[PDB]
Design a protein around this ligand. Sequence first.
Ligand SMILES: Nc1ncnc2c1ncn2[C@@H]1O[C@H](COP(=O)(O)OP(=O)(O)NP(=O)(O)O)[C@@H](O)[C@H]1O
Ligand SMILES: Nc1ncnc2c1ncn2[C@@H]1O[C@H](COP(=O)(O)OP(=O)(O)OP(=O)(O)O)[C@@H](O)[C@H]1O
Ligand SMILES: [Mg+2]
Lengths: 1030, 396
Amino acid sequence: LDIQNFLPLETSKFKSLTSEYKMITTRAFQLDTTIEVIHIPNFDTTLKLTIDSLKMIKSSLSTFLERQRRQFPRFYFLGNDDLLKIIGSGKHHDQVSKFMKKMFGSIESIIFLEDFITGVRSVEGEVLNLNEKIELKDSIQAQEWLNILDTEIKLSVFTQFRDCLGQIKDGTDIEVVVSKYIFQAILLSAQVMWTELVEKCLQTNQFSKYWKEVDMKIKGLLDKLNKSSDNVKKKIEALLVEYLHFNNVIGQLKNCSTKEEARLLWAKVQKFYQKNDTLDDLNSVFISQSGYLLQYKFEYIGIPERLIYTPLLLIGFATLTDSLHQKYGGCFFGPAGTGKTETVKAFGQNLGRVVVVFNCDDSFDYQVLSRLLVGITQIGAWGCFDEFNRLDEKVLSAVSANIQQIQNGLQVGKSHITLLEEETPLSPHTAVFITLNPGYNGRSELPENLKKSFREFSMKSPQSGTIAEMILQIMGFEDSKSLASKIVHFLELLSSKCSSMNHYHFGLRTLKGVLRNCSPLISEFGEGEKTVVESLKRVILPSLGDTDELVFKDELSKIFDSAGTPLNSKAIVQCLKDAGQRSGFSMSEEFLKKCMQFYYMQKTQQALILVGKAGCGKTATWKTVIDAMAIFDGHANVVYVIDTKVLTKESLYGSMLKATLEWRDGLFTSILRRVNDDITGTFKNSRIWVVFDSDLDPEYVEAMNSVLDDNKILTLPNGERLPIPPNFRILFETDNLDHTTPATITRCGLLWFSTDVCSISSKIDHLLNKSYEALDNKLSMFELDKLKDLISDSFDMASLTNIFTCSNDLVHILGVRTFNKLETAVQLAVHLISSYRQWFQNLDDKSLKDVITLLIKRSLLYALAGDSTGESQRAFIQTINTYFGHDSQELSDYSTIVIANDKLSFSSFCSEIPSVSLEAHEVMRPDIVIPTIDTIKHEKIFYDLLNSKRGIILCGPPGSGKTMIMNNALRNSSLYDVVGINFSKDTTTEHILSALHRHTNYVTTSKGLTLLPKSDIKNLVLFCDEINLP
Amino acid sequence: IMAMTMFCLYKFDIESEQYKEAVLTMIGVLSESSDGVPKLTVDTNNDLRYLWDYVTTKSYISALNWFKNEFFVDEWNIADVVANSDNNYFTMASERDVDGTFKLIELAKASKESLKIIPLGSIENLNYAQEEISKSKIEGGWILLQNIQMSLSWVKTYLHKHVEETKAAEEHEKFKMFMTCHLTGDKLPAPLLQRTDRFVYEDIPGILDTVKDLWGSQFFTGKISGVWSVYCTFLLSWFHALITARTRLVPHGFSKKYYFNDCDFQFASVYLENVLATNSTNNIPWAQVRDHIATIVYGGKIDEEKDLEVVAKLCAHVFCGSDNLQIVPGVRIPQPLLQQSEEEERARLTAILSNTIEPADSLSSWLQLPRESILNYERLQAKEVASSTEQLLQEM
Ligand SMILES: Nc1ncnc2c1ncn2[C@@H]1O[C@H](COP(=O)(O)OP(=O)(O)NP(=O)(O)O)[C@@H](O)[C@H]1O
Ligand SMILES: Nc1ncnc2c1ncn2[C@@H]1O[C@H](COP(=O)(O)OP(=O)(O)OP(=O)(O)O)[C@@H](O)[C@H]1O
Ligand SMILES: [Mg+2]
C-alpha cells in the first residue's frame, strides 16, 4: 500500500493493464490449443501495446529512484530492492536502521525516543549521541530526515572533539575523558594535543619531561583496561595503539644527534593541526606530513581495530598523501598479507573517513559497482579496489575506463564528469585506491590508461623488530626494548644457523605467535625475558628436528639466559606415567618429551599439528596426554578421530545440493552441533577433541581457516558462522606437510616427531601385552600364565637386535620399515604359540622350548623377510639360526611341526603333499589348484596371518598365483568367506561398500551401536585386487 | 640477430667449408657455447681475419655490428622509410624509455608539414579523435595517435574496422596516419598490424642531451618560485637524466628494468616547490628532500632492497652539496650567487650545459658505476644475439 501510495499515476496504469491481460490469458487458455491463439483478435496489437506501457512504468520507477538517490547519495550504496523497503517502511522509521549498516559502514542501528532520534550505535558497539535529537513526523520523507542525520552525526563528532580537546588542554587525566567521549573524538583530541605538546618540545628539547609524562598515561591506560567493561575495553585498546605511537616518536626524538635530525623525523610523521583562526568548523582540522596537508573530514568511524604503527605504515600514509596532493590515485601492489587495503582503510580513518572497499571479482556484479562509483563521486568518499587485479577482461576494461573518468575529472577538476552514459557531478573530495596482489606471472599491473592517473607503491612486510617492541609494551613491558631486539636477533639467527627445512618459519608471524603464546605464560611467571624464553621453547622447539634442536638451545642461551627450573615438573609427569602404564606404553626420553611438548601446547593452542614418519607414536602421544589430563584436571575428553581425506569437502564440512539448494550438515559441522546447539549432557565440564588422521591439504583447511583464525567460528559455504568453545580442540596427525601453506602452519601449534618415540624392545613389550589381553577373553588364566612365561624365556632382545639389523641388509618388495614390521611378528608369534596350547600341557620341558623357538623363528622370518625374494628368505633363515642359540631348533625353507590324527604325538617333519586327480571336463575350472611344495607353503602362512587377524598384502608379478593361493585357502575353510573387489585407476570408496552390502547385514546392537557384521554368522574376507591401482 | 643469421644464410652456401667452421667457431666465442681460435690461412680470408680481431680484443658491440656492415646496405631512417613507403598508415613501437612522438614532429616539419598530435585519453579524446581522423584524410594533413595501446578496447571496434574500410584513404588526399605502440605492453590486433607499416624507434639520447632536453621545457612554466628554486629544478633535471641513464644498463646497474617518467620528475619538482615554499632559503633543508625523493617519489616503484639503496646513493650525491657539487667529473655546479637574479641564473645554468662535452666513457665516468661493469653488459647482449642466431639456423 505504501509503494502505490507514493506512486499514484504508476499503480493506476499498472492495474488498468492488469485487467486487460487477465482477460487475454483466460480467453486464450480456454481455447485449448496454443496454435488456436493466432486466430484470436488483437493479440499481437494488445501485447505490443501492453509491453510498451509496462516498460513505461518500470522506466518511471527508475526515474523516481534515481531522483530519490540523487537527493540522499547514500542510497547509491543501497540499490533498488533495499531502497524500496526504506520508502515502504517509512511509516515504521525504525526499520531503516538495518540498511544504515550498509550506507555508512561504521554504524549498525539507529537510536530513537521514537518521535526523536537520540543517536546511533556503531557496528563495533559504540554509542554516539547527537547534539540535537532529530524530530520525526508522518509527512517526512526518508530522504529529508536522513540527510539531517548525516549532517548532525558529523557535527556531533566535532562537538565531542572540541569538548574533549579543550578538557585535556585543561590538564585532565586521560582515564577521565575515556568514560565520557566517543573514541573517534578522544583519538583526534589526543593527536592534536600530542602534536602541539611535541611541536613545542622540538624548540625547547624538553623531551624527557614529556616522555615519562606520556609513558605514565600508557601505564595508566593499561591498568584501567584490565578492570574495564568490554565496550570501553575496545576503546582503551584502540587508544593504546595510538599512545604507543606518540611515545615512540618522542623517544625517537629524544635520541636524535641534532635538531635537523629531529626535524627530519618529525617531517615524516603525520602531524594533526587545528585552525584557531577560522569558521566552518568541520573544516577546522587539518593534517601535515612531508610538507603536505590534508583536511580532516568529520565522518564517524566508530571504534575500528587500529593498525599498529610501523615506520613502514607511515611511509604508506606518506605515499598516499603524496599522490592525493597532486590529485592522483593511490595504488599499492605487493604480496597478499601485506595489508595494503588495511593501510588504505587506516589512512582514511586517520583523516576521518570510512573508505569503501570493493572486493573485486568475488563474483561481484559490474552493475552494483557502477552504482557504487556514482555514489562515491557524489558523496565525495574514498573507494578502494581490494585486489583489483582479479577482474575479468571485459569487466576490467569497463571498470578501468570509468575510473579514468573519475581520476581525470579530479586532476582537471571538471565540475561534472560523464561516466555510465550520464552527466553526474564530481565532488573533489573523491579518490580511488587500487590494491594489486601479484599474479602467477609476477607483480600485477595497472591498465595503461591508469598508469598516468595513479601512483604505484611496493608494499613490503614490516621489519619485525618494531612490531615486537610494541606488543611487548602492551602486555606489561618490563624491558620491552631489550626483548624485542633480542627475540628478533635470535629468530634471525636461527634462520641463518638452522638447516633449511620445509616447515621452518622464523619470520614475524612466528614471533607474533611467540608473543601470543606469551600472555597466559606471563600469568604463570613474569612480564620478563624469562617468560619470553619459555614461550620460545614452547613454540620454536616442538617443531625443530634433532640437529636444529641444539642450534636453538645453543643460540637461545647464547643470546639470553633466564632460568634454572620448571614448575609443573612432578605434577603432569606422574599423571603421564600413570596414563601410559595403563595404555601399555613405555616412558622413554623421547616419548616423555613429545608428550610434554604437546601438553604445554594444548594449553595455549586450539589447533595442533603432529608430523612424523608412519609409526612415530603420534596417536600414542596425544592419546596418552589427553588421557593424563582426565587424571590431573578431572575433566572428561570426547574424541572424534576423522580421516580427513576419506570424505569429500561436502561430506565433511557441509554440502549444499545443486538445485533445491538444501542445507544438510556433513560430518565436521555436525559433531560441533552436539557441543554448541544442544549441550544436553555434560559438555561444559568435558574436553572435545576433533582429530584428523589423514593427509592434510589446502582445499580442506581453507574451508575451515576461520576456526584457525583469531575468530574461533566456522563459516558455512552458505548461511552461517558457528562459534567454537575453548573445549573444542582440533588436532592434525600426518606424515608430511609439503602440501600445506606456511599460513596454515603458523595459525596452529606444530609438533614435529623427529624419530620414533620408543625403543624396539619397548614396542614389542607393549605389543605382547596388548596381544595377551585379547587372549584372556578366549584362554584360561592357568593356560595364559604359562604361555606368557614361555614367550619371555624363548626370545630375548639381544638375539633379535642383530636379526632386525640384518633385515635392512636385504631387498624388500613393497617396502615397509623394520619398526612397522614388529606388530606382524608379535601377533603371529603369540598366535602360533596359542595354537599348540593343549600340547603344552603334557609335553617335555626341553621339547616344549623347541616348539616355541621354531615358531618364533618362523614368525620372525615372514615378518622381516616375508616380502623378500625367498632366494633372500632362505638367506635370512640361516641369519636367524645364526643369531639365535646354535643348538636351538634350526629353521629350514620348508620346516614344519606335525601332530597325529588319532593320538597325541610330537615330531617335526616337512614337505608332504597331496596329489590331485581330475577328469578332462574338470581341467579348467575357476578354482583349481595342483598342490605344490609352494602351494601348501604359502597357503599355510597366508592362513596363519588371518588367524592373527593382521591384514595381508600379497605382492608379486601377474599370474604368480597370489589370487589362487588366497582363494583356494579360503574357498576350502568353513571359518572365512570371500568377497572379491577388483580395483582400477579410478575406483570409489562406495564401490567397496556396494560390494559389501550384498554380503553384509547392519544390526543396531547396544554393544557397538551401529555395526556392520557379515550377513551370516562366520568371518568375512574382502579380497581387494589391484590395490596399488587407484 | 637478423644480421648474423642472414650473413650465415648467404656465406655458408657461398664460401668454403673452412670458412663455415671458422665463423661458427667465432659465433661460439661471443656466445658461451665454446671459446676457440678459427682456421688461419695467410691472405686466404681478410674480412674474417678482421672480425676475429674484434672478438679477441674483447670488444663486443663492434663485432656485432660487423655482420650489419658486411651487407653493404644503407640503413634506412624513419623518414626514408616513410617516403619510400606506399601506405597511409604506420605503427611505430618503442621501449618505454623513449617516445618517437617528438621525432615525428621534426619528421613532418622537414618535409610535407601537416602535423597533428592526437592523444587518446578519455572518452572526449577518443570522441574528438574519431572526428579528426575522418576529416584529416579529406584535408590531407598528417595525423598521430599517441600511445594507442591504452585506449585499445576502442581500437578493435572503431579503428580496426575504420582503417580496414578506408580503401578510400587510397583515394583520399596525400595523408599519413601514425600510431605509437609500446613493445613491452598489450598486444595490438595482428590483422590491423600486418596491414600497416611498422617501425621501432630505437633512438636513445645521451645523459647531457637528456639533461638539456629536460631543462629546455622548464623555462616555459613562468615564475611562481624563488631564484633559488631554478637551481633545484636544475639539480633534478640532472638527477632524472642520471637514473634514466642507469635504467637501460641492467643487470649491472639496476637489478630490473624500471621505468621513470615525466610524472616522476613532476611529483619530485612539486615536492621541491613545496619545500622551498614552506622553509627558509638557508641551504640545510636538504636532508628530508633526499628521503622523500629517494623513497616515495622515485623509490615508490622500487621493490628490491638492492635498488632502493641505489636511488638513495644517487640522492646522496645529486642533492646534498655545499658550494660545489661536481655532478659529473667534468662539471661542477655552484650554489646560487649573492647577485640573486632568476633570469641570470637560468642563463648561467644553461651555460654550464653548453660548456660541457659528454665524454667517451660516459656510462662509467658519469654514472658512478665501474667500467668493468659496462664491458660485462656489452658481453651479455653479445651472448644474446650470438645464441639466438645459432638457435635459428639449427631450427631450419
Ligand atoms: N599351483 C598351480 N597349479 C596350477 N596352475 C597354477 C598354479 N599356480 C598358478 N597357476 C596358473 O597361474 C595363473 C595365476 O593367475 P592368477 O592367480 O589369476 O593371477 P595372480 O598371479 O594371482 N596375479 P594378480 O591376481 O593380478 O594379483 C593361473 O591362470 C593358473 O593357471
Ligand atoms: N612407548 C612405547 N612402547 C611400545 N610401543 C610403542 C610405544 N609408543 C608407540 N609404540 C608403538 O607404535 C604404535 C603407535 O601407533 P601410532 O598410530 O601412534 O603411529 P603413527 O606414527 O601415528 O602412524 P600414522 O602416522 O599412520 O598415524 C603402536 O602400535 C605401538 O605398538
Ligand atoms: Mg596413527
